[PDB]
Amino acid sequence: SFNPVRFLELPIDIRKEVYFHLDGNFCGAHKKLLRYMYPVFATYLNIFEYSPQLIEKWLEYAFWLRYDCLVLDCFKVNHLYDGTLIDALEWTYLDNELRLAYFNKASMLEVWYTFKEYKKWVIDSVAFDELDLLNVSNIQFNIDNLTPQLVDKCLSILEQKDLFATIGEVQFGTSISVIRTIRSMESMKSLRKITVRGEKLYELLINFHGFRDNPGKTISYIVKRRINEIRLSRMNQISRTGLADFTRWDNLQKLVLSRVAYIDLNSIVFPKNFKSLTMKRVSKIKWWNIEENILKELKVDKRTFKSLYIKFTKFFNLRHTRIKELDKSEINQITYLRCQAIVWLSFRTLNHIKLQNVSEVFNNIIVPRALFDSKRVEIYRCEKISQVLVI
Amino acid sequence: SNVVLVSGEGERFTVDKKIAERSLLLKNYLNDEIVMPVPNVRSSVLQKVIEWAEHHRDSNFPDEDDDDSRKSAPVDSWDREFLKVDQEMLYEIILAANYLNIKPLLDAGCKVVAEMIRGRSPEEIRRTFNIVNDFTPEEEAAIRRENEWAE
Amino acid sequence: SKEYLPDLLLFWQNYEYWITNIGLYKTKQRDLTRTPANLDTDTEECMFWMNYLQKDQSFQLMNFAMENLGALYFGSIGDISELYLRVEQYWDRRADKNHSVDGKYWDALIWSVFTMCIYYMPVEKLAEIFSVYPLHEYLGSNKRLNWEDGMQLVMCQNFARCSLFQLKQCDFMAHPDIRLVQAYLILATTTFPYDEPLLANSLLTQCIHTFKNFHVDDFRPLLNDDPVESIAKVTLGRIFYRLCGCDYLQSGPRKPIALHTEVSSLLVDVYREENSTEVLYWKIISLDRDLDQYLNKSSKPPLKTLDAIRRELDIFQYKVDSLEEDFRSNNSRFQKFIALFQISTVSWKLFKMYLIYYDTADSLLKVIHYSKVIISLIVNNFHAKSEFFNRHPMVMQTITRVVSFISFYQIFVESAAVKQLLVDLTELTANLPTIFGSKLDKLVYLTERLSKLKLLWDKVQLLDSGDSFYHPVFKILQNDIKIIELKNDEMFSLIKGLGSLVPLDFRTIVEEFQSEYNISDILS
Amino acid sequence: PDIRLVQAYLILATTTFPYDEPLLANSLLTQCIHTFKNFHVDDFRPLLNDDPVESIAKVTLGRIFYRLCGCDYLQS
Amino acid sequence: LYKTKQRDLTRTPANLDTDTEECMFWMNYLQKDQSFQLMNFAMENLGALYFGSIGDISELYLRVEQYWDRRADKNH
């Protein structure tokens, strides 16, 4: 069979990548116990009510699933790895003492931990030094799965305790539940990330186009500097009001766009320190409209310019697209330097760009040679993209 | 000609210049025939590593920058039969892959042992809780009484 | 095995930073009262070297630099043909009393190239160019000495002194110029900064001050920039990274001003806009900065930086192999060796940190494997007409860290593989070029001192009086750190300059170690 | 390097010498900062545990640092 | 108006040997008795300026006496 003692003999690096491929769904789910044990967790297991054996099998799991030696070591590595190996540990309220919960890819609860017990294993048995034992910032706060009657009750527990300082990020999305939290990020000095879902709430807090200064309803002045990464998901048009900006988010560095139908980069305005932009599962993308600016400087017809470009990359070549470069023989060195400066005009402070699961791009893709030669341009799973131009 | 590398048991295996393409550590050596000593890897386990790369020498594996693509990649049917030899020997192959820096072999080998965590029945968890003895006896005993109340 | 071995290895990091990094090279203490200040007619020695060169001798000297020393003078003006006009102009006027500040700067740069070229020049080519006879008739430490008897060392030093003498006549403090930086970078390739760390540390401060006076934040030419000044800006970008690379190598307690404020490769200075050949060389140096910044710090490095560097190091191996190598042209071959050596050195550092802190498996084997290829690189070029490739200062730093760590690990843990590597490692030291001189001799003393420290380790039985184990070997090891610690401290020197006050069983076997082993020869 | 280099320059700052040769004075000031920072003193307050002469020497080093800070702003 | 300076390197003559005799000439102009009156004037008229950096000049009276004696000796 399988013996956990032999597995623990493996090196930590080998053990790390084993848990990495596991994705953290230890349970693996896809009469009296149902009568009494189940109603406590009935809310989380209401979707899978069609299969009685699956719940009963998971009911047998949940007795000692939390108290498992193998699962205990997974979080021990995770704390040693800053919680980046499964995801997003969060706060949940249930059976009125506010334990921590972890939800897998199936969005179902697997393991519950109370704060005192959780701190005893994956901090005391992990930290071999005295380096900031209280800096457990991987935990987050979520309001999507909490009713407004439960949000004000759990926040009151956080208010009279020190658990608000350890929260790393908050989840957003006329809501009384939302308006209650707005007066709380000031105390959360460790808050660094804010993510929102839904089209309506985006313009209320994050977007500043058409913004109205509403004290108590919008993010306050002090909090805005603490945020450096914003994640957006489940949107139709990011520039619904025409213009999208992040200038007030002066500390923003990385922006994540997910599950958005149409995105136009021309309308989006980035702050001075914006450096990384990653987009995944985006349907339509309109790149920066840079081609004509090169044409004016060259003063060459586009059809003639189509005869100008000429066909290390073997490390990361992809069959979907083809790499093309501007010819150096026809262009003067001074003229070529002007061409490079035009590209950097639309690339003010960008350093990392990522493309994943796109459907179409309605223009030529222009990227500077500096970013391409550093393998920081990731056109992945872009089977519909025909060509990309490197200048 | 071809690249010949010795094993930790002293056996010499000349394969070619091409099978060495999968192993990244071979490229740091041919910077300017040549031989390479591999002390940790045994002769018997090294044979399986060689025979694995010749079959996958034509296929193209996904890029290392992607994290979701290789995670979601299912296990090849042909790879499954070759990897299943023994639970202990599987660890030897995985350790051998790490030294040779053959990522596709490491990913395929890990998927087998990663799936074994799923396959253990709920009855197995009941007995595995006591082997590590990570719980103090008063706390080890403390976990027990709340189960029969729920039972 | 041993119980406290993981804790013992953590102490080695402090030993490496002080004994080898700072104590061996970065420190030099000379009493000001005993040392006489230079005066008039004390430059007559340099004046004897001014007229030693002839009209024909120096031209063939520049012919050697343009053929095989390509990879080193890119810190200066890239083209060497345009330097032929300057050297002709330097000999155009030699009896003219009048001198110009602009003209004087060119003379200093020209002499700087001569010092660099002659330092990398093989001994056999130097025999037919210069005459050994009429130079020691004036002065000399030895009445009869050949070119192999450390002669190239003393002649290289005097040329460097004459290069700085011309700058002193120009009053470079009064008139800053870009040629002040260009001259210093050429001398950086020579081992001159190691001999006078105090002089080089403060001279580099002027280069930092001079460069920052231009107020050129971005080196990318703009649309509105003139064509003439656009080429100057991209040229100035090359100097910035070469200066930053040479600035980090001189970093230490004596230098409080640093120019390398760039952000390391992660995931607020200027970075990630160009990928020239000079930028690529600095990128490797930046990777070494991340690992070496934890030597003094007690906190262990995060496991991502230890892992992200590993991913980054693999990318750079593809770039160096992608560069075309020509056997006929030594410039491409010399550049290939420099890039290959730097990548291998960082890999040795990275896996060494794995063993000390987290103790991952197959980490000791990787250290042995990565140290073996270091030996191969030095051996391979020595076989076929590349004996001067080993004169670069970088190989001296790599050798010191691999010789000491292996010996240090051997005296505590006995392994057959480690023992066999040491005997070949020691033999490489004896075959190293003699141009290093004093620094090479002190290397043998350091490894020999640790060689039979093992003999004392097993001679005295281990005694334990508690959880922490005590041994006479540890007391002497920590004492060596303390001895160099006080010498590097200039706190007591304030008392010398301000006020009339002077600047500030088991023991039997310890004092025997200290009486017959005295590492405190650094001041000499 | 020695402390007297800093002391000599501060006397020259009392007259109109720096204004006559702005380039010379700026280069000299950098060397004064470079030599002063080699001592690496964080707090200049006297220390009871240190030697009485060393504690006194740190007090008179405090007034030199303040003059250096003042000359930096005046020559900015 | 104060911190600017325009100089051309081509027209400016560099410093040469035997051109520093002007620095030596002014030293010979000063006499042993003349310098002592200069130091006497700084006791009460130049206060709050030298005291900030060098402190008292009582010990400097010992240095100037040694300065004249050191001039005769060639060793430095």
Side-chain angles (χ1 to χ4, degrees), chain C residues 282-504:
Chain C
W282 156 253
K283 285 160 153 290
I284 317 183
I285 306 296
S286 67
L287 280 186
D288 203 338
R289 178 174 65 197
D290 289 6
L291 305 167
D292 276 16
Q293 81 159 311
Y294 289 104
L295 291 190
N296 51 2
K297 314 202 181 163
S298 74
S299 69
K300 42 182 57 182
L303 203 48
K304 284 63 151 163
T305 300
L306 282 187
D307 269 2
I309 281 176
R310 185 180 178 181
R311 293 199 293 263
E312 183 87 49
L313 275 170
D314 291 331
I315 291 176
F316 277 68
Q317 196 83 49
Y318 209 69
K319 288 187 193 174
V320 298
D321 285 345
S322 304
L323 299 188
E324 306 181 8
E325 173 209 343
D326 177 35
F327 280 130
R328 310 153 301 183
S329 188
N330 279 325
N331 299 328
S332 187
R333 282 180 62 219
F334 197 33
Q335 181 62 260
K336 183 70 176 295
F337 165 69
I338 286 183
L340 269 173
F341 204 80
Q342 288 296 326
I343 293 309
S344 297
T345 310
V346 179
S347 290
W348 186 89
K349 306 266 192 63
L350 173 71
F351 276 83
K352 159 185 163 297
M353 309 268 306
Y354 292 166
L355 184 136
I356 301 299
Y357 293 90
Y358 297 102
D359 194 338
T360 175
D362 68 89
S363 177
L364 188 153
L365 276 298
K366 287 274 187 58
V367 167
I368 290 178
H369 161 59
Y370 272 126
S371 57
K372 198 174 306 302
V373 69
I374 291 289
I375 309 287
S376 295
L377 285 179
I378 310 286
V379 160
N380 191 22
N381 52 52
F382 182 76
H383 270 177
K385 304 273 300 312
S386 297
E387 69 272 14
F388 69 97
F389 276 18
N390 300 347
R391 307 200 186 200
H392 207 281
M394 51 175 188
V395 300
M396 191 45 68
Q397 305 282 155
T398 300
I399 282 301
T400 43
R401 278 174 164 86
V402 302
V403 164
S404 66
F405 173 74
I406 286 176
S407 79
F408 181 82
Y409 190 80
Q410 213 270 330
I411 62 170
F412 293 156
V413 175
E414 289 282 341
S415 294
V418 182
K419 174 52 211 73
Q420 193 267 330
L421 187 58
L422 192 66
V423 59
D424 192 21
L425 181 51
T426 304
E427 198 260 348
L428 187 74
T429 303
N431 286 112
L432 276 188
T434 58
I435 201 63
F436 295 101
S438 164
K439 287 311 186 280
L440 179 59
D441 284 344
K442 190 99 189 176
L443 200 153
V444 182
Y445 184 76
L446 183 63
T447 176
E448 182 46 4
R449 162 181 158 105
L450 292 189
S451 293
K452 51 182 172 93
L453 174 51
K454 173 181 68 177
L455 273 297
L456 192 149
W457 160 256
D458 58 341
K459 184 162 301 323
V460 169
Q461 300 296 109
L462 168 65
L463 188 153
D464 46 347
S465 285
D467 54 353
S468 63
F469 292 165
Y470 293 99
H471 208 267
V473 170
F474 292 165
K475 267 294 301 167
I476 62 171
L477 270 192
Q478 309 158 69
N479 279 320
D480 215 347
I481 300 301
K482 194 162 51 93
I483 298 301
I484 313 190
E485 188 99 10
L486 61 89
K487 291 180 183 293
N488 290 318
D489 195 16
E490 210 170 355
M491 191 35 77
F492 318 119
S493 296
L494 178 71
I495 313 297
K496 174 66 192 71
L498 194 141
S500 290
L501 276 297
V502 59
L504 276 297

